Design a protein around this ligand. Structure first.
Ligand SMILES: C[C@@H](CN)Oc1cccc(CN2CCC3(CC2)C(NC2CCCCC2)=NC(=O)N3c2cccc(F)c2)c1
Length: 371
């Protein structure tokens, strides 16, 4: 247990993301920061906002250096605008180091911050290629590795339903997982891009061309709540999940995330819903492994009734393995060896468990990738 002080350093609210404490500036200003492997900017709320309990006050930080350049980050669901600068940054429940990092001071935003989420900023852990304004703005993790001896790796244990978890920086904590860690290559260093080679619903192959699973990319994203699937894959997966859960019928809108279904406290029939398996490309020629998720992961909780939302949704920008997928596992972002590791999380029911299994023989896996 050498990484013991980093265990349980994450907090959150169901479907509102996981956040870590980060200390910025001099004297110290500690804020709650969203852990986001799907973006590459370190950015903090820097002006009052109704959804913010606290914000970064640059005038109070003697070490703050204004880069005198604006930054704008737009997404489909929201956006933010701010000012670029650099300041001293430490993670009190993270590595024992202090770095000078790029920081975007968010002055205006639209549908970005979440009311009651308890976080005031975002830590983009992906690579420089997708940083804004461009790839010359060094991401936080790159600054960390360049300025210190911290090994070029981090790992995440996101615990599902108030939520908690651990972000281990510079290593792997063996108390956070059971069984073996199975690695999939990082195809390209921009998002944490991976290759899905096969999909099963209750052991039944979806039988789609594997190029469709990765069209136009498949990413591992701690900042996205859902498992997001390309339209054609989503349609086939829903059709298969509906057929496997036919002991009870649900309205069409439930599968589209438009309708919620609620059950009396402790009566959710988890047993009627299928398990879902995603096969990932392994580290050896023709070898793959699979990660299996339970309905406890893909039906997320939103009194006497437990309300759930179907947390598999459609995408037009590739597959997104969000918190739905990550919650069943201990996930290792091995940047040094360009690979992502999965193991069963130390954080299910009496009949089934999330699993990481292999090896399997899968031929022509290279044909599954989009070019
Ligand atoms: C925790 C999550 C719960 N919905 O809320 C947030 C809020 C802010 C940021 C993030 C991280 N994160 C920011 C980026 C994200 C996902 C979540 C996105 N990513 C795409 C990029 C292209 C490839 C596929 C993935 N598209 C969106 O519209 N997003 C978004 C979602 C919600 C709000 C938003 F402003 C942007 C998540």
């Amino acid at each position: 247990g050498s990484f013991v002080e980093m265990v349980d350093n994450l907090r959150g609210k169901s479907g509102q993301g996981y956040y870590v404490e980060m200390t910025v500036g001099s004297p110290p200003q500690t804020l709650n920061i969203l852990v986001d492997t799907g973006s590459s900017n370190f950015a903090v709320g820097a002006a009052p906002h109704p959804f913010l309990h606290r914000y970064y006050q640059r005038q109070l930080s003697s070490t703050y250096r204004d880069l005198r350049k604006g930054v704008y980050v737009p997404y489909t669901q929201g956006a933010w605008a701010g000012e670029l600068g650099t300041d001293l940054v430490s993670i009190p429940h993270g590595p024992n180091v202090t770095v000078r990092a790029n920081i975007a001071a968010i002055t205006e935003s639209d549908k970005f911050f979440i009311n009651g989420s308890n976080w005031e900023g975002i830590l983009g852990l992906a690579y420089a290629e997708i940083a804004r304004p461009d790839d010359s703005l060094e991401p936080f993790f790159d600054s960390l590795v360049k300025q210190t001896h911290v090994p070029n790796l981090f790992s995440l244990q996101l615990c599902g339903a108030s939520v908690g978890g651990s972000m281990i920086i510079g290593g792997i904590d063996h108390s956070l997982y059971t069984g073996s860690l199975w690695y999939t290559p990082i195809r390209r260093e921009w998002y944490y891009e991976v290759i899905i080679v096969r999909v099963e619903i209750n052991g039944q192959d979806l039988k789609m061309d594997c190029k469709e699973y990765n069209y136009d990319k498949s990413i591992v994203d701690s900042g996205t709540t859902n498992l997001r699937l390309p339209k054609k894959v989503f349609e086939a997966a829903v059709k298969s999940i509906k057929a496997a859960s036919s002991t009870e019928k649900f309205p069409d809108g439930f599968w589209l995330g438009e309708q919620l279904v609620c059950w009396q406290a402790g009566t959710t029939p988890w047993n009627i819903f299928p398990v879902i398996s995603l096969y990932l490309m392994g580290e050896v020629t023709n070898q793959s492994f699979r990660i299996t998720i339970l309905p406890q992961q893909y039906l997320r909780p939103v009194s006497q009734d437990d309300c759930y939302k179907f947390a598999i949704s459609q995408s037009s920008t590739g597959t997104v393995m969000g918190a739905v997928i990550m919650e069943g596992f201990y996930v290792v972002f091995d940047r040094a060896r360009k690979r992502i590791g999965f193991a069963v999380s130390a954080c299910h029911d009496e009949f089934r468990t999330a699993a990481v299994e292999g090896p399997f023989v899968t031929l022509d896996m290279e044909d599954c990738g989009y070019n």
